């Protein structure tokens, strides 16, 4: 559905950083689109939340020293059945905002055993 | 309904009668489109001083001309063994019987050929017989 | 200049004795002191050429031209790679033995 | 002592007049009693240019049969000799061209030895040689991390 | 890195002792085998013809000692009498290299006092496939390679001296006829006056 | 010479003692690392052994002295050199000072010696 990314302090409530839209297989993959970004001055060590109001709640997925030019990358690690497994916040120098990218997990290696010729 | 796998690791047929029975184990792992949650895994030991192990009460795929496969691992901390793995076919025929076949295989080779092709695996009779109980020789002389 | 080649060969033999003993014992002392790379090679250059200067002053008696034809090529060159390999050999021997 | 006998007979000029001559009739006598510039130019041309062939494809195939491994010191030492020997060894208007050609092809043999040492990998060009003297990214710099 | 001292005392000195003894043996074998000298064992007439050839060669080389009136006569008489009348050293190195790589392979012998590049890790460490060993910690074949270069001072200090006919005669007469006589007796007086005054 | 062998043995003893002391120090430092480099008495003893070895090498050169060939007395000919002069003007000064001839196997005719004449002259000298 809609993933609300929101930073927060230790005991106080959350402060929203953005809302992104997970769309399950329009024509291709489940890759995100950005609905709303938040131009809020944020600086310091904060707990980031990635709450989806329908499917998945994350009380805190990352603890980052956020700066006001938030040059981050919301990596949404997804599954085979296109459900949000994990959310993480990567750093990206050429980003200028918080853009959300869906990450599919890499196929693990398979060993080339001997075949029946 | 449930199949039984016999076997015989002949240790008295090579004058290795002085041994510990618990250092040789026989593992069984189900493959080939089972119908349970987990595949069936068993591990037995010897039954007699002759060396005749036996797996029993194995769950099978109930259906006409339907197969259920088992990889048998005869392992021993004392001796090397000649068939490293044994594929077990448990085909429920329309014959009214339950055909048990066994195929030799070594470690590091697939058990079924590709659907495009084929080379077959060497058939095992039935008890079965892991031959060649020559010692494992851990110690390197220097 | 017409040279007497037996005297040339004998003077080069005495100079080779000095340079061989000096290179081997400089390697032994650079191994006893546990000297590393650049300090060891600069040590060998300084003390080996100082031993050559003491050879020109004391043995050649401030005139190595009557004892060596081309004295700069004979005393400071023509055994330089030989004595630096002997220094490296005795240097590795003393550095490994300490 | 008394002086030498050659000098007692050298000062008196009357002794040589007294010194008579023996008759010599059957007395036995002892036994016995430009193109040079062009050949010199050809000999010097063989001294400066016919040494070049050794530095030619014979030496190229001789260095091509060593396979470029460091596992022996004979190819490395012969390549150091190919480096240092040409370095140690470096009608008037005809031999200057061969004199320049000699040191030029000695430099060519030096480049052949350099090509051998570079194909061995024994020359510090790439970053695998200057890797031990390469510093570390100090990642923490004021934090500590401990795990369960 | 804590190495074994017995590795030093049983690899450094035995390899050096075996290498100086095989240098002594190579010098002794190459003296005993090479029995030839500057002269050979020939019959008398071959020695006489070679002596006349070498007489023409010595006249070419030492005509400067004579005057013109004697060099001309000797040249005429010599013309009238001439016209009318590699792997043996690398086999012990291969044997000693194999003996080092057979008796002493499998352990790091010592540390060099100078660092080299990483490519020398492919030659100075043999029985050790460890990749984090820098090229200072070396095997015994490195001590062979170092001792091969550096034993010439030790070889010197122990006292070892450190490791058809008519066509040729007519060619020597042709080289004798075209020579330019440049005697050293022409201006010997001014040379003596320059040297001793 | 005597001073050369004395300084050779003294430098050998000093270098052996200093090498053993440096071995003890560097193999006690390896046990204490499981900073504090060489104490300067061992360094100065290695330098003393090196200086004494260099003096033993350079005092092995004795000045070239020669006995005269003809005369037999208490006179020894010395040019005051440690090495032999290479120039043939000055190389043969040794041969002219002592009374020899370097091509004496040609000049003196040692193959055509009348042996009976030498024996006659020596017998007549011993009889007189």
């Amino acid at each position: 559905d809609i993933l609300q990314l929101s930073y927060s302090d230790d005991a106080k409530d959350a402060i929203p950083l953005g809302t992104f839209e997970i769309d399950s297989t329009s024509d291709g993959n489940v890759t995100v689109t950005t609905v709303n970004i938040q131009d809020v001055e944020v600086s310091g060590e904060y707990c980031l939340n990635a709450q989806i109001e329908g499917k998945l709640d994350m009380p805190c997925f990352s603890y980052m020293k956020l700066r006001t030019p938030l040059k981050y990358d919301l990596i949404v690690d997804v599954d085979e059945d296109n459900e949000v497994k994990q959310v993480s916040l990567s750093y990206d120098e050429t980003n200028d905002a918080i853009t959300a990218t869906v990450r599919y997990p890499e196929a693990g290696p398979t060993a080339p055993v001997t075949k029946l010729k | 309904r449930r199949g039984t796998i016999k076997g015989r690791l002949d240790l008295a047929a090579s004058n290795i009668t002085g041994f510990v029975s618990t250092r040789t184990s026989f593992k069984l792992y189900q493959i080939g489109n089972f119908s349970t949650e987990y595949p069936y895994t068993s591990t037995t030991m010897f039954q007699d001083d002759e060396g005749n192990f036996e797996f029993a009460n194995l769950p099978l795929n109930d259906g006409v001309n339907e197969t259920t496969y088992y990889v048998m691992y005869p392992a021993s901390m004392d001796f090397n063994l000649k068939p490293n793995r044994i594929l077990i076919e448990f085909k429920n025929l329309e014959n009214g019987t339950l055909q048990l076949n066994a195929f030799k295989n070594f470690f590091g080779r697939e058990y079924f050929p590709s659907k495009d092709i084929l080379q077959s695996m060497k058939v095992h009779p039935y008890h079965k017989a892991p031959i060649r109980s020559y010692l494992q020789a851990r110690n390197v002389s220097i | 200049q017409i040279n007497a080649t037996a005297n040339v060969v004998d003077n080069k033999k005495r100079l080779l004795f000095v340079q061989d003993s000096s290179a081997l014992v400089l390697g032994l002392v650079a191994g006893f002191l546990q000297i590393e790379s650049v300090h060891g090679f600069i040590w060998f250059l300084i003390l080996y050429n100082l031993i050559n200067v003491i050879y020109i002053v004391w043995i050649c008696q401030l005139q190595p031209g009557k004892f060596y034809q081309s004295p700069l090529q004979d005393i400071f060159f023509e055994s330089f790679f030989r004595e630096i390999t002997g220094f490296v050999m005795a240097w590795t021997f003393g550095y490994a033995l300490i | 002592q008394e002086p030498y006998e050659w000098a007692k007979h050298l000062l008196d000029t009357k002794y040589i007049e007294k010194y008579n001559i023996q008759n010599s009739n059957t007395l036995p006598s002892p036994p016995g009693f430009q193109k040079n510039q062009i050949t010199v130019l050809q000999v010097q041309k063989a001294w400066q240019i016919a040494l070049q062939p050794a530095k030619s494809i014979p030496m190229n195939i001789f260095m091509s049969y060593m396979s470029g491994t460091s596992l022996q010191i004979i190819p490395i030492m012969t390549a150091l000799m190919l480096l240092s020997g040409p370095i140690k060894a470096i009608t008037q208007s005809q031999v200057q061209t061969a004199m320049f050609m000699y040191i030029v092809f000695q430099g060519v043999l030096m480049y052949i030895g350099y090509r051998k040492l570079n194909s061995m990998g024994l020359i510090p060009n790439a970053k695998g040689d200057w890797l031990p003297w390469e510093r570390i990214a100090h990642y923490n710099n004021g934090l500590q991390w401990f795990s369960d | 890195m804590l190495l074994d001292d017995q590795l030093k005392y049983w690899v450094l000195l035995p390899i050096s002792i075996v290498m100086v003894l095989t240098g002594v043996l190579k010098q002794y074998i190459m003296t005993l085998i090479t029995g030839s000298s500057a002269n050979e064992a020939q019959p008398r007439v071959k020695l006489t013809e070679w002596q006349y050839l070498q007489w023409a060669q010595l006249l070419i080389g030492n005509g400067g000692n004579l005057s013109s009136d004697a060099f001309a006569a000797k040249k005429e008489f010599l013309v009238k009498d001439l016209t009318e009348e590699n792997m043996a050293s690398f086999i012990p190195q291969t044997i000693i290299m194999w003996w080092v790589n057979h008796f002493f392979a499998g352990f790091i012998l010592m540390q060099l006092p100078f660092p080299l590049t990483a490519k020398f890790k492919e030659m100075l460490q043999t029985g050790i496939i460890c990749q984090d060993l820098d090229v200072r910690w070396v095997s015994s074949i490195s001590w062979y390679f170092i001792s091969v270069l550096g034993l010439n001072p030790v070889y010197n200090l122990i006292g070892l001296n450190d490791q058809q006919v008519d066509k040729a005669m007519h060619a020597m007469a042709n080289d004798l006829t075209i020579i330019q006589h440049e005697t050293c007796l022409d201006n010997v007086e001014q040379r003596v006056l320059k040297q001793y005054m | 010479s005597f001073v050369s062998k004395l300084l050779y043995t003294v430098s050998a003893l000093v270098l052996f003692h200093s090498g053993f002391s440096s071995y003890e120090f560097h193999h006690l430092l390896k046990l204490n690392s499981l900073i504090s480099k060489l104490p300067k008495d061992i360094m100065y003893e290695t330098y003393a052994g090196l200086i004494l070895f260099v003096l033993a090498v350079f005092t092995s050169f004795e000045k070239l002295q020669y006995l005269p060939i003809e005369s037999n007395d208490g006179k020894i000919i010395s040019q005051g050199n440690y090495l032999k002069e290479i120039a043939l003007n000055k190389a043969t000064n040794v041969d002219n000072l002592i009374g020899s001839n370097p091509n004496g196997e040609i000049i003196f005719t040692p193959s055509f010696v009348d042996v009976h004449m030498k024996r006659k002259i020596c017998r007549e000298w011993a009889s007189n």
């Binding site: - | - | - | - | 002594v24 990483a118 984090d132 | -």
Partner: protein
Amino acid sequence: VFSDDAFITDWQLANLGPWEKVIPDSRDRNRVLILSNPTETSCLVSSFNVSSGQILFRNVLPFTIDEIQLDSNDHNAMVCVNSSSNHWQKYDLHDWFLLEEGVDNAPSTTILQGFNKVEYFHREDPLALVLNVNDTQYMGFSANGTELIPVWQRDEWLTNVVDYAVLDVSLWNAYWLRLTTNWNRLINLLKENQTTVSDLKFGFAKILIVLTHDGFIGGLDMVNKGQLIWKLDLEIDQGVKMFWTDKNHDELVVFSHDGHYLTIEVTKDQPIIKSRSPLSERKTVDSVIRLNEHDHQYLIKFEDKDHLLFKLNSHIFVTEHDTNGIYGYIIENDTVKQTWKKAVNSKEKMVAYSKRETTNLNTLGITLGDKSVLYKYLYPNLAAYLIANEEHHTITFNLIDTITGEILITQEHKDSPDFRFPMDIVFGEYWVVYSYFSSEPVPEQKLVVVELYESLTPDERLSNSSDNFSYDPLTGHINKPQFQTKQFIFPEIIKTMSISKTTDDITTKAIVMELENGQITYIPKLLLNARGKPAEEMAKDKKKEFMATPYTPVIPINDNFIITHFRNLLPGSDSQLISIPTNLESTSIICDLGLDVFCTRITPSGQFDLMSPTFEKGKLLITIFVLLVITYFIRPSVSNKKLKSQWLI
């Protein structure tokens, strides 16, 4: 390299538990059958010499003490009936031959001085009396001579080892002092003339300070055969962790499951408990994490998921794994505040975890054949873990940042895996090796290697090592890893894995794997090559390193690398496989505490720091004396041939 070291360089404390029931063997009467080590799902049944004190065999049976009984029609056979599923198995008592078994019908089965002794055991009337003397000590007396001499002795205090600890056991006046001392030493040497020492030098002599589940502390000597130097009963319930206090290794802090910490001063001979104080909120300690050894504080985690920063005599991040998720914590000044959680869903389970081990850095990267460096991802604060998904049946390898807690690398294995088999992660300097079990290529055991580099293109270092730059990983501004992965088969099922720790971490890290049959092998990291091309493609293309191993995705079990040579080693289900760095870089101590403490010394790159025991000194001196004899005999021939050259020619 092995036959002179078997049962010599290694040792095993073949332990039972406390002997719950002892059953005499009717076929021998010199053997006995002990039920011991009673867990809630298993029991150790062993056959044991009552005249020699040695265990003949051991078997961890899946039946409890109450379920295991004796057959009525055959007293030389035991019937074990799991009554929760009616599964019965009949075993012979002599050679442990598995007799009849089934699910339907179980057979009719019956039921089963010293210094302050507490119990009798095996009262056999000819001989072989056993006295359970202490609570966990068993002595055995025979009567050869009608005097009851002590024959064997056994101390089963070491059953379920939790933690451990390893105890390693002006100028002229100086010149004249040196000269006089060396003069007196040479005088004493020339007047005197007219292993257990090298093990102290090489660091082999160590003391294992094993902490058991009952609350005991031991002193197992490493260079002995596991000889108990000293023992101490802490009279606590379920000791949890054990750390040194200071860097000089003189005192331990043993925490317990009731919330008590004990400071125990460890001397050379015997330790005394010095403090037995409780904690602040003492309910149930789960695990303790030691932080910043120079400033002695700890992170005591409770069973109620609570935390306590504890202290005795800028930021600090602590990650903590559980069966469901991995959590982060920061220590600001003295408080423990949680920072992130990589929790799992209802169908997933964290099955393996390993922090990145703080290895000593020797090389910044891997030099290839073109001398082009592939730089290692040497960023610390990494943790690798496995997520088992039973809904999709997948193995998800994840690599987390543990400061910000972002998943750097994810890897799915849809290899139809089995979660009833052991799975383990070990983390090297720049690589992860994780073992699981699956059946899609073949039904054998899988080993996946993930090597992390800064970039996969050579000579492309992405880390800023400049002097005017300092990384701040709490911002997330660190370089990201690029990985290379391979999967290998393995014939035996791996129970647990470890990395061999050496002194400066120079020699190749051996992934030491304890297998499910009790055997312990090790695979070197050179043999697990993640940038492996096969032997066809390895010889042609030259971009590999010097003697780079190819990709062999089979890994046959090398019997030379089985370091439990012919030993009936039985680690339990806890069974921590630990490695101890000594001196003498090539070797490392591998111990296998948890039911039987086995310890050995392995050399993954060969023993290059030490002279071999079968080093040919005799042929060496023979060759030296032969060269001396040949030179001394051929020298007068040369001295005569040079004289003949001087005279004849």
